Amino acid sequence: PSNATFKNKEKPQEVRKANIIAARSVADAIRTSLGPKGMDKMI
């Protein structure tokens, strides 16, 4: 009765993991600039 499985490639997140980490660095940048209590940046 077990069956189920349906896995095949074992790293579906590998492509979508580091991209979120790269997006989190961008997301963490606006967290410090958000709201009137936020901070500014220099480019």
Partner: protein, 517 residues
Amino acid sequence: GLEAKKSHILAARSVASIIKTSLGPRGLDKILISPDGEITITNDGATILSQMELDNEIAKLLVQLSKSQDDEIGDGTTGVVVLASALLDQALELIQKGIHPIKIANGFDEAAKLAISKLEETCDDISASNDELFRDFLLRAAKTSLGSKIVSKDHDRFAEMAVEAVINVMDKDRKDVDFDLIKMQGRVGGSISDSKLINGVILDKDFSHPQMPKCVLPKEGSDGVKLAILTCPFEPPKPKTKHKLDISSVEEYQKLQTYEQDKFKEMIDDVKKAGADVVICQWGFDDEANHLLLQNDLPAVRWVGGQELEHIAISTNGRIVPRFQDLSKDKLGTCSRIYEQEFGTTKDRMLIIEQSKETKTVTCFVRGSNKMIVDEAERALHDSLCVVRNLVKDSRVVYGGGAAEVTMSLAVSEEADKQRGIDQYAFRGFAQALDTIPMTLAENSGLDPIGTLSTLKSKQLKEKISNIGVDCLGYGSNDMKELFVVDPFIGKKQQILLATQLCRMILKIDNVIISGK
């Protein structure tokens, strides 16, 4: 600052993601490569972390934690260590929520104290039952949990012999278990189902001379050869310091050999005067002494280790002999039958010593069809005297398999709403992470993690029976009582407590300074 928190958590998440598939009897095995190229295939998380390249100190702390956990039960090591790693993800959110790390560590400690009384509620008492039910419970307790690998198909042959091995070493007065008295052997060849159990000590080394008879016949004694252990080296006496022998005549130089020729005679005569037959020692033999040793029908073995002589001294029930002057009839051993068997084809032989009466030395013959299985067999063969040691110390017996972790989680979750305060999101975060053990069982068995919690909640809550759990064997019932999945109370209690005590440290890590090795 707080950026180091994710550095330690992601390091543990990478380790937990590797061993995630290693949980449960349906799990898979990791290959362990040594720097010299030796291959080790095992499911034990302690052995995987033993030989590996590890950077963070947390991975080294898991080895120290596994040392105390492997000495308790000895099975399902993957289903224990990883449970503490899941608390780091729940604590990571609490850091985002602003909870102090000490408040997180103290929260996991208070929530683990209530799990003691909830686990001992329905636990069965095996002390009231006789020794017949004690053997029947222990026989079918390991069969599900014990084998994670290889022989776990045919393990029924190993489980039947594992139960009969403890009965000889354990007296009926109270219950006592000593795992150092029973050794563990192994062989490469044949099949895995050919393992046999003989009562006595079995030496893997064989005789040192080709013409030595393999099998010995019974005699006027116990039918044994009256085996004796000789620690003194076999050789003519040699002064440990220098010796200068002045030779003034041909006779003085010729009588030097007459000495050792008489020493070889007196050494063998003392064996015949006492009536002994097979005598083994730690050191080797001479060229001329092997002739008179064979003609007198005195089988012997050389280069015997000191660890093997311990189980031999128990089977013989004699005394260690430091010098040849201590040989006596009363110091001889008592054995029943001793046989020697050649194994694969041309492979060497082994001395199997049998004891008619019940003794404390039981050696289980081990056979396997691959060398990688033998290295795997080191962990797989004997977990028994560690498991039964928890049953004999505490008669309380519970049922594992992922069922109790969900029951105790809902009990703490109900107690979390009573305290309110900061203990609400704390205790609930601890109980919510305890479902990873049955959830991982749903990964190998292919069950819905959402339906996993809903199935146990609709049963273990309304019905007082907590035995409802994940079935990975593909049967028609989720009850662990009918499927015979048994874990020791005091053994599993230590697995839960030691897992929570690990969080008293890692959660408080802030700064790390590593000096040059």
